[PDB]
Amino acid sequence: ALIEDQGLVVVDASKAHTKATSFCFRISKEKLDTAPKRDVEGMGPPEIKYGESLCFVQHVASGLWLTYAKKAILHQEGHMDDAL
Amino acid sequence: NPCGGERYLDFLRFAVFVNGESVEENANVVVRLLIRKPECFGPALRGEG
Amino acid sequence: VQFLRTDDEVVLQCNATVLKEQLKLCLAAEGFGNRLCFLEPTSNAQNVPPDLAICCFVLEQSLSVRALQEMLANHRTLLYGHAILLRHAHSGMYLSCLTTSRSMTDKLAFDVGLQEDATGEACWWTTHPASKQRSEGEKVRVGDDLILVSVSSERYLHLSTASGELQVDASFMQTLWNMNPICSGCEEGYVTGGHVLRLFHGHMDECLTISPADSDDQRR
């Protein structure tokens, strides 16, 4: 999660409120987010494949992107390579 | 009410026992019906003290 | 998806009231090092996430009473009044009714735990509908409420609060259970939630880890 004092850390389940530990997957960094799809009562369509779909991770509460400074960091801007 | 339930108990006893032998179906039905209403057993067999 | 089926990952849930507040509890067990089952709260998921790893169960088999009796004498949809077998997702053991009893207020109650082998009749459970709106041979749909009966001890799954703590046992008092599925057959090669996986950076030459056990950074 993200904490104001230490930054990107790992915390116990007791302190992990929803705001700090909410993360999302995205395929494009510059693209603006649209309205989220309603939750379906079923499996739904598949989108992300193992070992083939490069992805980015974003903290939904701040919009920052993860990268390397090899310690990992969160940055307002991206970097040359941030796919996983 | 102790003086009341004795009549129903004796009727059930007549229903279960015949000619010196027991009928399995009625006995099973009666036991299964009784165990699901523990208050039929009176204060003595209560689990709560 | 509307009707339950075998080989699907499902969660057993119940509802209770404490201090005029409604709580939803999930059945859970550990298996390794502890066989007794317990209850995990799930109402406060917005602040303290629960532990869903040890709550998932898999519907192994569903059969009729006569077929089960004959077998012991030696993707099907499930119906009311049938006997089902559940397997723990993590430990691989089967939910069953035990002979020991920790209770002190109920003399006829039994404890419920895990069993390492599917042999014996103690591992099978029969399902019954809650009210008259459902038939004896009717199919089971999601969102319903069911009553579970052991085929060996002939008792219902009971939620006990006599000692002030919320516990599970087998007794002659009935309680309503909600069978909520969490996973079904998914497409091969496609990622799904609740899985364990590795994250690789670049051409698989790097991965996302933490410090070892003896590191001075408190492993954080």
Curated annotation (Swiss-Prot), chain A:
Channel activity is modulated by phosphorylation. It is found in: Sarcoplasmic reticulum membrane. Disulfide bonds: none annotated. Residues 1-43, 45-84 form the MIR domain. Cytosolic calcium-activated calcium channel that mediates the release of Ca(2+) from the sarcoplasmic reticulum into the cytosol and thereby plays a key role in triggering muscle contraction following depolarization of T-tubules. Repeated very high-level exercise increases the open probability of the channel and leads to Ca(2+) leaking into the cytoplasm. Can also mediate the release of Ca(2+) from intracellular stores in neurons, and may thereby promote prolonged Ca(2+) signaling in the brain. Required for normal embryonic development of muscle fibers and skeletal muscle. Belongs to the ryanodine receptor (TC 1.A.3.1) family. RYR1 subfamily. Homotetramer. Can also form heterotetramers with RYR2. Identified in a complex composed of RYR1, PDE4D, PKA, FKBP1A and protein phosphatase 1 (PP1). Repeated very high-level exercise decreases interaction with PDE4D and protein phosphatase 1 (PP1). Interacts with CALM; CALM with bound calcium inhibits the RYR1 channel activity. Interacts with S100A1. Interacts with FKBP1A; this stabilizes the closed conformation of the channel. Interacts with CACNA1S; interaction with CACNA1S is important for activation of the RYR1 channel. Interacts with CACNB1. The calcium release channel activity resides in the C-terminal region while the remaining part of the protein constitutes the 'foot' structure spanning the junctional gap between the sarcoplasmic reticulum (SR) and the T-tubule. Pore opening is mediated via the cytoplasmic calcium-binding domains that mediate a small rotation of the channel-forming transmembrane regions that then leads to channel opening. This is Ryanodine receptor 1.
From Swiss-Prot, chain C:
Belongs to the ryanodine receptor (TC 1.A.3.1) family. RYR1 subfamily. The gene is RYR1. This is Ryanodine receptor 1. Homotetramer. Can also form heterotetramers with RYR2. Identified in a complex composed of RYR1, PDE4D, PKA, FKBP1A and protein phosphatase 1 (PP1). Repeated very high-level exercise decreases interaction with PDE4D and protein phosphatase 1 (PP1). Interacts with CALM; CALM with bound calcium inhibits the RYR1 channel activity. Interacts with S100A1. Interacts with FKBP1A; this stabilizes the closed conformation of the channel. Interacts with CACNA1S; interaction with CACNA1S is important for activation of the RYR1 channel. Interacts with CACNB1. The calcium release channel activity resides in the C-terminal region while the remaining part of the protein constitutes the 'foot' structure spanning the junctional gap between the sarcoplasmic reticulum (SR) and the T-tubule. Pore opening is mediated via the cytoplasmic calcium-binding domains that mediate a small rotation of the channel-forming transmembrane regions that then leads to channel opening. The chain holds residues 11 to 243 of 5035 of the full protein. It is found in: Sarcoplasmic reticulum membrane. Residues 75-130, 137-182, 188-220 form the MIR domain. The lineage of its organism: Eukaryota, Metazoa, Chordata, Craniata, Vertebrata. Channel activity is modulated by phosphorylation. Activated by reversible S-nitrosylation. Repeated very high-level exercise increases S-nitrosylation. It comes from Sus scrofa (Pig). Cytosolic calcium-activated calcium channel that mediates the release of Ca(2+) from the sarcoplasmic reticulum into the cytosol and thereby plays a key role in triggering muscle contraction following depolarization of T-tubules. Repeated very high-level exercise increases the open probability of the channel and leads to Ca(2+) leaking into the cytoplasm. Can also mediate the release of Ca(2+) from intracellular stores in neurons, and may thereby promote prolonged Ca(2+) signaling in the brain. Required for normal embryonic development of muscle fibers and skeletal muscle.
